[PDB]
Amino acid sequence: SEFQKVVVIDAKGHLLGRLASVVAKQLLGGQKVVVVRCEELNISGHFFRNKLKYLAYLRKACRYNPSRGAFHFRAPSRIFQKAVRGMLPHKTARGQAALEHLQAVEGIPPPFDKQKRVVVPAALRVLRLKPGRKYCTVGRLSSEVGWKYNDIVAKLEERRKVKSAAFYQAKLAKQKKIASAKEASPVNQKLSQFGY
């Protein structure tokens, strides 16, 4: 257990409910949480079943003024926020104030692409679903129910990945130089019996 000022979570390969439950508990603990790459979130069950579930969600509306009726957000970040909102006591000022500590986004915008992004093992698809079980991605589900910025995020994410890769090569070179100069120091053996 550890407390960070803000936690940026790479939502790739995570399960919607498992991550939303972990995030919702952290928000109620008073911690600010940022969730990036919401279009890569996974849901158990094949897509068609998930698509039918969301079409059932679209059916809910007020018989008078659907503008009062339930607002069905299509963006993957908004889907994740909806799952978290159903896990927070949002009608209450405590659970409402815990919502503005959550910022779910699609892709990794500039303020967060230069920050460490941790993952939640309790919500990872590889560690939770038996192999061979069908699953869908929220990004593809959103693109079929109305979300219309799928390929823009894909292009911007590809460009960001290239830039991040170039940074990593620079960091690898610097760390390689540090490691090479590390062993030359005689203290490396003077620290050996201490376990360092």
Next chain:
Amino acid sequence: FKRYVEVGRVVLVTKGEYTGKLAVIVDIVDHKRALIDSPCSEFPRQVIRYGSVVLTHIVMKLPRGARSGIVAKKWKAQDVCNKWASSAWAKKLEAKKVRSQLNDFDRFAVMRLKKQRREQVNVAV
């Protein structure tokens, strides 16, 4: 795959009272259990589940269902001791064990020494 559950494989127990101990698969009871043994006296022959152990890369020749005495002599013959330690995985494990056992004065001495170590940061231009 490089880890196969087979008779003679060296395993490292990761859950239970025998956490951190080294053993060898003497027999395979079923897909979820196996009978293991260790030459050390503190580790008795027992049936353990696959969830509480991790498969090491060392495989030693051992007949099926060998008694503890046969297991001990084969363990000494194939010098599994210090053969497991030769791997960097074991070296990291003992480093963590030593680091945990460090006291306050040792931590201060480590701080000063690694301060002297970080002093150089000398790289070719």
Next chain:
Amino acid sequence: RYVIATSAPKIDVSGVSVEKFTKAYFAKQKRSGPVKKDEAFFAENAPKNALPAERIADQKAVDAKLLPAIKAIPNMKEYLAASFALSNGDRPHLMKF
């Protein structure tokens, strides 16, 4: 209840008398009156005033008697001069002092 006994090597204190340190030795002065406090009162006490030369001599004597031990054991003088502090990722119930 307000000390953590570290596992650092012991210091030889057999060579210094400790029987003169008693409750009466460290006791404060009697007041028996609610009237207290003043800017001049804060100007009083202090290290400069009070602090009898007898207390000064004992502190100097015990200090000089404890230098030879801490000089003999390496890295103890800097260890004593330093200040203990917790950093990120330090769990007191795990670390042993």
Next chain:
Amino acid sequence: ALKEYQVVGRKVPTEHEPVPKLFRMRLFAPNESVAKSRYWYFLKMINKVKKATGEIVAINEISEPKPLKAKVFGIWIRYDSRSGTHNMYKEFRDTTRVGAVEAMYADMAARHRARFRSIRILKVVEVEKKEDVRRNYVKQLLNPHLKFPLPHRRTKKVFAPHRPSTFY
């Protein structure tokens, strides 16, 4: 939590039966109280002796003689279902009779939805010859060159910094 119990008992002496016969059963129960209860349950249904008119003459716990040897146990049971007309024979590979019986109870509950009351164990025997084993999965475990990958790796501290390797 089961323990194998040998229970010997007889009906109380009477004028008609001055020397009543002694009946002994090997039966698995969590404690001595249940073991005696099931023992009277089986006698009450077979030999016309009630716990009121009978008595337990000996109670003993049987420990596995060779618990460090992998064995195969074949269990005949009289499964009771919605129809109640079922006889089952199953084989389990384990190191102790108590362990095999407990594995049988869990297996019957999981597959056929059978409770401790529905199942009654007719006989548990040790299969010593490989050719006597008729279960394919047990024979597969009896393969001389058995070896398989470790399944279900799965390996608090929420918010791990690196993606798990979950591999070898």
Next chain:
Amino acid sequence: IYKDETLTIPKGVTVDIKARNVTVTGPRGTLKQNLRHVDIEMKKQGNTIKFIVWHGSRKHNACIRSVYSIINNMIIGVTQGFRYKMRLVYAHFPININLTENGTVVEIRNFLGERITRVIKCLPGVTVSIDEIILEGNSLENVSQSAANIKQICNVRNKDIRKFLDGIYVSERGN
């Protein structure tokens, strides 16, 4: 506990199965397929390919031979390829076939006298040439799908099948 199948690698140059993707490169061409849909070990040892299934049920084990057949078909396509010849059948109105983009697009006209021109685009890697049409390619599945699409395009609707036998049917399919 273990189910194993063995296949002999042909004279094909590259049989790379990195990341569970089979990029089979041979003298005829290079075909890339994804085998991540099945959790099967493809163990490559010289000129032998071993398909192993561990702790699999009947349904899981049945996919082992299916994957072996798929790999064999990919090897055959990368070695010699697959060619399917279909003969058009016309009774009164001749069927006009036009090839575009070197046979990548097949346009059918005057089918049963209809004035609507049916345009079908063949799958990548399949070439159609000319009352017989031969489609040749490296991906046997793609060639078969293109042939099926052509047959479905040339279909009779709301007519008696026994009397109206017009259409295009596959005659032969080999290497």
Next chain:
Amino acid sequence: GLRSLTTVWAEHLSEEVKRRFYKNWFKSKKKAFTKYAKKYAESTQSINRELERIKKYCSVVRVLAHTQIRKTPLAQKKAHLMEIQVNGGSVADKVEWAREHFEKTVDIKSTFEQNEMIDVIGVTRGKGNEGTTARWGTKRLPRKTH
């Protein structure tokens, strides 16, 4: 969605389009775009960086155009201003076309070709408040209605 990265104006803007920025042009000091004109004359490099930014990052280019309403017989003197999307060619070509056409006029003969099917967009003539018979076309209730 789309986000307006930046806007570049011409050096000289006519009084007709400047009146669009004022509710009370008579009383105003007519100070709109004065400092913009000054910076345009003294330092064109800042303008050049702005145009380069549009060429480098922006994917959509729209020209701000106003109508010479003083040529029409209308009492209105505020020129109508709008954004017209420039399609065709690369973004660099659109910017070059836009910059070279600053302060110039574009005639409808260039745009439309005497037979084109176009859409006409406008606000319909206001009929004020109306009842459901006229607003919605419902049937009139019988003469006997109370």
Next chain:
Amino acid sequence: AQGHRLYVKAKHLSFQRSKHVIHPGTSIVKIEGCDSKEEAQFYLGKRVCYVYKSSKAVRGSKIRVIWGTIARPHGNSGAVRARFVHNLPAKTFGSSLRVMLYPSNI
């Protein structure tokens, strides 16, 4: 600047409650790095404080403190129970507390 913080970070989770009834007298405190009741046994009896800042300078200080003591563990996850001299306000849920290292026994 990392030569201070002789305490342990903690967070005020909630009150001792059932589904529908709360007991404001005792608070549930989650100590960082404590993940089981065995670890919480070390922190039993320690002095946990809630520090806050207010406009008016009582004693010429902008900071007020509510003191308290850790009483017993709570659950299997290492959360503890604390009794404060003045019960903690219900608005301090998710606020940070400071668990000193005294009264020490190590």
Next chain:
RNA sequence: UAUGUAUAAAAAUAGAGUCCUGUAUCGUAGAAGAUGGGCGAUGGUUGAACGGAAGUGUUUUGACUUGUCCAUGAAAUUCCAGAAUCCAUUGCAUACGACUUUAA
């Protein structure tokens, strides 16, 4: 609401570039961090280009040296705390507001 407001590869999981998570790495000694000195190093911390996805930044081009020894100082805090609107005008609008105009 802070007490170190320390950490930027992408990936697959029947594989990745040694693995078997970060209990790790980076930083951490000095009146909440003083005043001096000797050796050693020539490092370290701090007072124009690039970045548009939300570019809030990144990169580069006068104090302070705990790299290493030495000497003074701390206390009695003597046990926890220049525009818009009105007035006026317009009818492309209009129940009234509002809207569209004009008005030095």
Next chain:
RNA sequence: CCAAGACGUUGCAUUCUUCGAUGUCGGCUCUUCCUAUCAUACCGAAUUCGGUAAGCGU
């Protein structure tokens, strides 16, 4: 469902509320939902019968 679609078989009055009062049929008007589909679209079986289908009309 069963085989000779018969024979069988399995499914989809009360007086609780209102008597210090819930305006009582039909039409007209207007809206919306269901599908157990009349027409339209798409296939399938020998102008005749079914499947998806409540979009639009009736």
Next chain:
RNA sequence: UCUAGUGGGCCAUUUUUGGUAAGCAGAACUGGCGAUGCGGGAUGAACCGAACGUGAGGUUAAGGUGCCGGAAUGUACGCUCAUCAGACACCAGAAAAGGUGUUAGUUCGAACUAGCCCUGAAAAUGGAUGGCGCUUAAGCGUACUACCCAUACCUCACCGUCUGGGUUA
């Protein structure tokens, strides 16, 4: 001995009568509600636990521990893939017969017998395992520990009633 109120009852278990049926009418035994809060069943007069003076501490019942929600994203072995799965008694409802569904069993490849799932299954404002969501479950069956908390139990303080023992200093 004198007198009040009552002399409309209702629900549940098991037994049962009239009835096509009923949240139907009529009875028998016991317990409840009426007259009764409290913890649990999302919610509810009689269901489950437990019956209540004011408080402190500890421990429990029924029920539970993914989040909402206090408490194990516990342990062991399995079953299940559902194009509108399943999810805890009362209880908020479903059947015969079926399945190139799957896991097992029994008997001579075959017939079967059993679990889970699916079909049978078919409505009208948008919508309910309580919600979110859940698929090597956060579903289902069984075992096993740890943990959560009622006004219940336990120790203690105080209030009142009743009861018994003292009190001519």
Next chain:
RNA sequence: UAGGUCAGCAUCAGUUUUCGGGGGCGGAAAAAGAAUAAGGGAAGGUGGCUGUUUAUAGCCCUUGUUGUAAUACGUCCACUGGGGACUGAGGACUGCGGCUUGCCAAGGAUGCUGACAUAAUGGU
């Protein structure tokens, strides 16, 4: 000497919670196992050539010795070492005990200190 408000520790008492140690007894006087002597056995067959019976691996079954073995479990100690929390009712003496007349953890909390003497605690 005695007394105001809030605190910290100590030694006690009552209640309870949570870790640990030593010992006794019981069971098939645990079952096993180890080391060491025998007999017998076959394999899912080691060396030797698909087949055989400890060889250039071993396993199983039976019996003795070490053995009066150990450990686990059950159970008890008027055996014992810590950590935490709430509580301090009563008010000279009487009692029941222990110790050695005085003392004592024995018929309900005292002791040693500090800060503030404040709007601190408490009330509204």
